[PDB]
Amino acid sequence: MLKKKQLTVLDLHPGAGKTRRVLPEIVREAIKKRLRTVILAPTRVVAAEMEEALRGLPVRYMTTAVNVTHSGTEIVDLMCHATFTSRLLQPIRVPNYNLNIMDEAHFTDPSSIAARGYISTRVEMGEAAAIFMTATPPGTRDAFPDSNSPIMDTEVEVPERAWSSGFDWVTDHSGKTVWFVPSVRNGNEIAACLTKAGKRVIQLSRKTFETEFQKTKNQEWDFVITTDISEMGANFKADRVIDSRRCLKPVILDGERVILAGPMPVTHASAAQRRGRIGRNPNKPGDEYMYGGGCAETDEGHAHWLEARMLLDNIYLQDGLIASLYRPEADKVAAIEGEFKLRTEQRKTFVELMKRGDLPVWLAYQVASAGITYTDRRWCFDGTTNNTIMEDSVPAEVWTKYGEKRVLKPRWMDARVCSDHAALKSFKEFAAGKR
Ligand X SMILES: O=C(CN1CCNCC1)Nc1ccc(F)cc1
Q: What is the CA radius of gyration of the chain?
A: 22
Residue 16, annotated as binding a ligand: yes
Decide: is 83 part of the binding site for ligand X (CB under 6 A). yes
**CA neighbor of 99 nearest in space, from 26, 153, 157, 151:** 26
Burial, 56: exposed, middle or buried (Cβ in 10 Å; 0-12, 13-18, 19+)?
A: exposed
Q: How far is the CB of 392 from ligand X (least distance, A)?
A: 35
What does the angle CA 173 – CA 278 – CA 10 come to, to the nearest 5 degrees? 170
Decide: is 60 part of the binding site for ligand X (CB under 6 A). yes
**CA neighbor of 7 nearest in space, from 130, 137, 135, 139:** 130
Q: How far is the CB of 347 from ligand X (least distance, A)?
A: 20
Q: How far is the CB of 60 from ligand X (least distance, A)?
A: 6
Decide: is 63 part of the binding site for ligand X (CB under 6 A). yes
Phi-psi region of 16 (alpha: psi -120 to 50; beta: other; left: phi over 0): alpha
Mark out the alpha helices in 78-208 (DSSP H runs).
81-89, 110-124, 168-172, 184-196
Residue 64, annotated as binding a ligand: no
Nearer Cβ to ligand X (41/431): 41
Q: How far is the CB of 79 from ligand X (least distance, A)?
A: 6
Nearer Cβ to ligand X (31/62): 62
Nearer Cβ to ligand X (21/70): 70
Decide: is 67 part of the binding site for ligand X (CB under 6 A). no
190-209 binders of ligand X (CB under 6 A): none
Q: How far is the CB of 99 from ligand X (least distance, A)?
A: 18
Q: Which stretch binds ligand X (CB under 6 A): 60-68, 142-150, 341-349, 374-382?
A: 60-68
Residue 216, annotated as binding a ligand: no
Residue from the set 2, 48, 53, 62 that interacts with ligand X by CB under 6 A: 62
Decide: is 2 part of the binding site for ligand X (CB under 6 A). no
Burial, 55: exposed, middle or buried (Cβ in 10 Å; 0-12, 13-18, 19+)?
A: exposed
Nearer Cβ to ligand X (74/212): 74
Q: How far is the CB of 69 from ligand X (least distance, A)?
A: 8
Q: How far is the CB of 38 from ligand X (least distance, A)?
A: 12
Nearer Cβ to ligand X (70/378): 70
CB burial of 238-260 (b: ≥16 within 10 Å; e: otherwise) equals bbbbbbbbbbbbbbbeeeebbbb
Residue 198, annotated as binding a ligand: no
User: What backbone phi and psi angles, to 5 degrees, belong to 424?
Assistant: -65, -40
Residue 13, annotated as binding a ligand: yes
Strand partners, 398: 406
Decide: is 70 part of the binding site for ligand X (CB under 6 A). yes
User: What DSSP string runs through 145-180?
Assistant: ---SS-EEEEE----SS--SSS-HHHHH--S-EEEE
Nearer Cβ to ligand X (63/235): 63
Decide: is 64 part of the binding site for ligand X (CB under 6 A). yes
Residue 18, annotated as binding a ligand: yes
Decide: is 48 part of the binding site for ligand X (CB under 6 A). no
Residue 263, annotated as binding a ligand: no
Residue 70, annotated as binding a ligand: no
Q: Which amino acid does the sequence have at 185? A: R
Distance CA 201, CA 223 (A): 5
Q: How far is the CB of 114 from ligand X (least distance, A)?
A: 16
**CA neighbor of 133 nearest in space, from 230, 225, 18, 36:** 18
Distance CA 206, CA 292 (A): 23
Look at strands 240-243 and 223-226 and give their pairing: unpaired
Decide: is 416 part of the binding site for ligand X (CB under 6 A). no
Q: Which residues bind ligand X (CB under 6 A)?
A: 60, 62-64, 70, 83
Please state the residue numbers annotated as binding site for ATP.
12-19
